[PDB]
């Protein structure tokens, strides 16, 4: 439905969250649909964290981070923190901590993705993380649509923020305000 010229493949079911008939290039046939679906949800989240991160870091700095950062923006900080870590700074191991912990989360959840492909009860992208219980208390499946849609928006937005940074040093908040 999204592209009238080239509709979505019959491989895509219509009862999945975020289904709005958009697959003109038919990429679903090449790879397992469950693997692709979980890949999109994982990209959604990592991007959403990055998009909110890019905005927040420009908007606010935690106390004492400014001295190590100097004046680096969202992409620059990563290079600066690793450069200081190369020198041997204990304070500059922040990147290593997040790499270790995100990797640990991926390593513990490693079986889960294959279990979804194997036919296990877990649906792709669901880890049953509801401490708030907002989805359980309310109706689930409307926020799932919001999570995929906002995630797609964030995916594109993170690309916008990074490429804008590489061309011109300005990060997100500054780039939106200024109009070169």
């Amino acid at each position: 439905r999204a592209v009238p010229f080239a509709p979505a493949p019959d491989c895509l079911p219509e009862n999945i969250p975020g289904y709005m008939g958009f697959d003109p290039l038919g990429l679903s046939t090449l790879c397992n649909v469950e693997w692709l679906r979980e890949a999109e949800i994982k990209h959604c989240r990592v991007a959403m964290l990055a998009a909110a991160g890019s905005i927040a870091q420009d908007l606010y700095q935690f106390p004492g981070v400014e001295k190590i950062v100097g004046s680096a923006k969202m992409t620059g900080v990563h290079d600066k923190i690793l450069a200081a870590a190369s020198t041997g700074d204990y304070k500059a191991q922040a990147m290593s901590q997040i790499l270790f912990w995100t990797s640990f989360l991926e390593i513990v959840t490693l079986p889960a993705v294959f279990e979804t492909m194997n036919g296990g009860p877990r649906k792709p992208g669901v880890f049953f993380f509801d401490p708030l219980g907002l989805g359980k208390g309310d109706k689930m499946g409307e926020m799932e649509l919001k999570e995929i849609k906002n995630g797609r928006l964030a995916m594109i937005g993170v690309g916008g923020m990074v490429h804008h940074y590489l061309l011109t040093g300005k990060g997100p908040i500054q780039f939106l305000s200024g109009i070169p």
Binding site: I107, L110, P111, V113, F114, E115, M117, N118
Partner: protein
């Protein structure tokens, strides 16, 4: 000509199917095919990284990178086990 002894727990491993039974994986008979395939790719990347970081070998090589470099041949046997487990429905 006399009974040939085998260790206790020796079972039959001759196969003519698409894949051998998972019993040929020994202690890894119950591991899922996804778990071997992910362990195989993980072992290939960390083993290749650990191998690559010490290719100019020094009189002080990092012992963890040497030990981690053994994951590259181990990854070969892991993906063979991944193929065996997928073809056994595991």
């Amino acid at each position: 000509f006399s009974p040939v002894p085998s260790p206790e727990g020796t079972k039959e491993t001759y196969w003519e199917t698409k894949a051998p039974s998972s019993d040929v994986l020994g202690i890894g008979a119950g591991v899922s095919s996804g778990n071997f395939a992910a362990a195989s790719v993980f072992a290939a990347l960390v083993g290749g990284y650990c191998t690559g970081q010490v290719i100019p070998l020094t009189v002080e090589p990092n012992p963890l990178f040497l030990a981690g470099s053994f994951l590259l041949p181990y990854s070969w046997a892991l993906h063979v086990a991944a193929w065996i487990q997928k073809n056994n429905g595991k």
